[PDB]
Q: What sequence folds into this?
């Protein structure tokens, strides 16, 4: 249907013309429709968070202490996005949150939580309540690689009235457990787990010591969240924020040990000698690590930070202080330059509805950062409270689960792409640069 | 500490004086503090929904189609209250909702959901998704009393890609099942179930046919909700609303079969010959059923409906030229009804914990929640996003009704502590006795 | 009776309390009859309110909001919208 | 009449610090340098649509 | 750091272009960021009040009778600025205020 989709009349305004004048906000323009020959469910919305990380869902949770901690990052990664753990915390806390995200989903669980036989049931209940993991292994001396003695699961202790009793009293004993011997392929081990109708399958050496552990919950998560953002080992992707001071070097090291996939630099004005040196140092010291630099709003800043070695750029400044830039113009200009140099960009700021996210992605951003839009969801940090007959969080109003909100944004982006007439947002960006996706500036009156 | 708690100076206004001049709303008055020698957690807030039903939580979900269906009634009963299933539906739908509430929690499950061996896995998945019950029994001919062939649980089907396969392929088969033989006491059966580490325990006769079923989920629910409102058989209490037309008689019959514990009459003005006749007929035909009559706002209406045989009264009215301010209505009707041994339900104008506390204190035994619980997850309707708000269909999301009920509970406890009495029964009695006192507030003092 | 040398008057979780002028009058009259002075604590927002509270029986008045934001209060000053507020 | 803003000394210091911070973000270490580079076209601006002013 | 500070792409609008159209207020435009290699405490804000007077603080108190008298002019000068004594007064009063400063 190329004859029907390709515009020859081209009745509309190209992005280049639209942004060649005063600085624009998202409400200043609208995107013209194209040609439709597909259902909205078939639209691909993925974008590059960084040079090497593609996100099925082009959404990133902002690294504000009111938005992103372990739970939010987990939720984002599960739906195909990613979260950035905030840095308003110590190195140890941030590393722990990163670990919580990374070790939530696994194939072979390599350091299974394990206890000694004499530990009270209270300890297992506390483990489940705090860290949310069942299937605790009982081993020699409590070592995660010790001799396997038994396993404790939900139904093993849910009826015990004396919480101080040792787990050995109620654990399922090793002699009665289905297990496997190292080595085994993950596919075979998980098939054995499915057939066994049990929740866990330890993998042991010839000395019956614990090598690793498979969890049925991982298979169920894979089924219920088929688009999860995953690294090579089957863990969820996780990102973390840091400033560019010399102290933060230590932080980065800790984060690298915690297993972050992306480091995100935290600065209102990232075109600094400190940030350039920091990017150089990180790329030298942790080559496996990808760096998101910023924030920037102009191509000159982008040039300096890409020269330093940035793998992506956060765009936004102002989204009093007399320095900044209208966000739609900033996104278009910086994204166009960075893309010309092979670097994707993240829209950070002023994204307050689905239409704004769609426009930001269309005019050049590969992914979008969500702050206010997801504040107040269940997965954000903070405690709920009732006030004036309202369920606020400490304040913002409750928006429910972020999973449903992410799905809603996904469907809206798909529908917008359909109306625009392209089956992917990569195609939309390309055709925008090509002049086949067209716009109209809107008079102030037309904005009502 | 009677010398310190008993008021002799009595610096304040008694309820009888407070309500003796003009119709009052809840904002027109405040309750004066008393003496405290206990922590708020020790406060008993229970009230009588009806002559024979005591509720640990004096809260009742209103029978509006936007508030109370099976899920809401389940939540209310679990937290120690009760729900009234609306009647804006057919007799069959209302009976099904009641049955859903009554059979959610059990001891021995008498009619366990069962399927034949050839049923597709998709059907069991549909059962779990719609009705939320696992541990489906597979028996000869799919009858709940048929010969037991196997059982299907979460882990038996969570991995199968072909949903059209018969359950016989993946079920846990009878020869490998832990079971028990009729007859058995519930305590022993549940202990055996716990020791077995399984989720279900069928109970069969000597012919291996299914007699009943024990579920571990019942024990866990009992553990997590120790104050649930329960009948003699361990089911949750459930109430249902009905009009007083002759047709509605059929409705009542259906509801009685579904097992409602309380019938709630639906009328803006319940002092009618139709409602009087209806109450007489219900008490004659279904003596086990308790009836909440109303709505009424005056003692004359209350007299007629209590004479008819009502077990409780709904208070509240306010087409526009007839009604009564709700605080006065509650005080007057509750005082008369209590003098005749009948409890009352405050229905209307309860918009915060202070209003509920005042309504209970001035004579209401329990309070009906409408707007206050609209928009909670358990209400009927689907959620939708609009302007980044997550409304439900025209109300804002309030989260789980369970957390809200706990919040209301704690607020009532704190109010009672400030008043200086350890139960709301004591508060009401001392109100009638003149030991719990009030102050009317000038319009300016209300800011 | 316990041995208090003075009383703080004021209340007004939401369903229990009392309008403050009545509270001051009643409590102050009783306490004075027993030789005990009283402190008006709450709802004093201007000089007229303080005068009335003292006149109807309070011996002294407690100042909260009325003196919040003075230089001597705890907290650091900051400029916002050209106003010089304190946190 | 106008509302009390306290000492003008503290206000002057506040303005000083703000001007310094703005100059830093602009990327020049003096306002003479800022003016010169403005005339030279090395300090750049963006006109803001009426909508962008919210 | 001249290679990093000097803009060659020049992604932005010069003052000359910005002011070549309708008359603008301060809210009509924003200043784009550049390159940072110094701490804010090192920034010099001085400007010339006149051909021969350099002010460490480029601030001048307006000569309105509600703003500047001896005390305000003293405060401005002490902080590195200057004040302008208003003229809604007699010669003698204005001279006395000047002497006080
Ligand atoms: N591989 C295994 N071999 C033998 N027994 C096992 C094995 N895995 C689990 N069990 C036992 O089976 C029973 C599982 O009950 P339970 O429902 O609590 O586990 P689960 O549902 O798989 O995970 P959860 O702890 O989250 O409930 C327990 O007695 C447990 O000790
Ligand atoms: N009384 C029993 N005796 C033997 N096996 C049983 C019995 N009841 C259930 N099973 C089987 O044991 C395993 C239980 O797995 P599952 O984790 O799904 O149980 P459950 O969590 O208690 O039930 P559900 O989660 O579906 O409500 C299944 O294979 C099930 O068919
Ligand atoms: N027994 C068990 N362990 C798990 C499970 N899921 C993840 N784990 C592992 O349990 C470990 C938790 O480590 P933890 O003690 O909480 O980290 P700490 O904060 O340093 O003490 C991690 O090595 C996880 O990989 C599970 O389902 N069962
Ligand atoms: N197998 C099983 N059955 C249950 C459980 N809990 C309740 N039930 C029974 O499941 C039955 C469901 O009734 P149903 O035939 O579906 O009524 P319908 O909705 O009108 O079709 C009820 O009779 C309950 O008693 C459970 O945990 N497991």
A:
């Amino acid at each position: 249907n190329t004859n029907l989709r390709t515009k020859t009349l081209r009745d509309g305004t190209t992005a280049e013309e639209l942004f060649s004048q005063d600085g624009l906000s998202f409400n200043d323009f609208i995107i013209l429709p194209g040609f439709i020959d597909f259902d909205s469910s078939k639209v691909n919305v993925s974008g590059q968070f960084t040079k090497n990380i593609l996100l099925h869902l082009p959404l990133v949770s902002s690294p504000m202490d009111t938005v992103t901690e372990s739970s939010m990052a987990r939720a984002m990664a599960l739906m195909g996005g990613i979260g950035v753990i905030h840095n308003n915390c110590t190195v140890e806390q941030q590393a722990r949150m990163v670990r919580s995200v990374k070790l939530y989903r696994n194939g072979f669980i390599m350091k299974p939580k394990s206890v000694s036989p004499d530990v009270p049931v209270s300890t297992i209940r506390n483990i489940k309540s705090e860290k949310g993991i069942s299937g605790i292994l009982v081993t020699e001396g409590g070592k995660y690689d010790g001799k396997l003695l038994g396993i404790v699961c939900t139904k093993d202790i849910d009826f015990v009235k004396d919480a101080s009793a040792p787990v050995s009293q109620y654990m399922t004993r090793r002699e009665n457990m289905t297990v496997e011997r190292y080595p085994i392929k993950l596919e075979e081990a998980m098939d054995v787990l499915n057939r066994s109708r049990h929740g866990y399958l330890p993998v042991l050496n010839d000395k019956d010591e614990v090598v690793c552990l498979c969890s049925r919950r991982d298979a169920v998560r894979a089924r219920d969240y088929p688009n999860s953002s995953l690294d090579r080992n089957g863990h969820l992707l996780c990102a973390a924020a840091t400033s560019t001071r010399e102290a933060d070097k230590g932080r980065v090291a800790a984060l690298s040990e915690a297993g972050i996939d992306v480091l995100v630099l935290d600065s209102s004005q990232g075109n600094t000698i400190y940030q350039v040196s920091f990017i150089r140092w990180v790329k030298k010291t942790y080559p496996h690590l990808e760096v998101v630099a910023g924030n920037v709003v102009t191509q000159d800043q982008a040039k300096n930070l890409i020269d330093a070695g940035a793998d992506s750029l956060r765009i936004g400044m102002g989204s009093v202080l007399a320095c900044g830039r209208p966000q739609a113009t900033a996104i278009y200009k910086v994204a166009r330059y960075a893309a010309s140099r092979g670097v994707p960009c993240v829209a950070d700021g002023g994204l307050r509805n689905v239409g704004d996210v769609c426009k930001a992605l269309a005019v050049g951003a590969n992914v979008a950062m969500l702050g206010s839009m997801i504040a107040g969801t269940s997965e954000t940090p903070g405690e709920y409270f009732f006030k004036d007959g309202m369920r606020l969080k400490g304040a913002v109003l409750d928006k429910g689960s972020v999973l449903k909100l992410l799905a809603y944004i996904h469907k809206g982006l798909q529908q917008s792409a359909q109306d625009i007439g392209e089956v992917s947002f990569d195609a939309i960006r390309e055709k925008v640069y090509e002049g086949q996706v067209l716009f109209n500036r809107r008079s102030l009156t037309a904005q009502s």
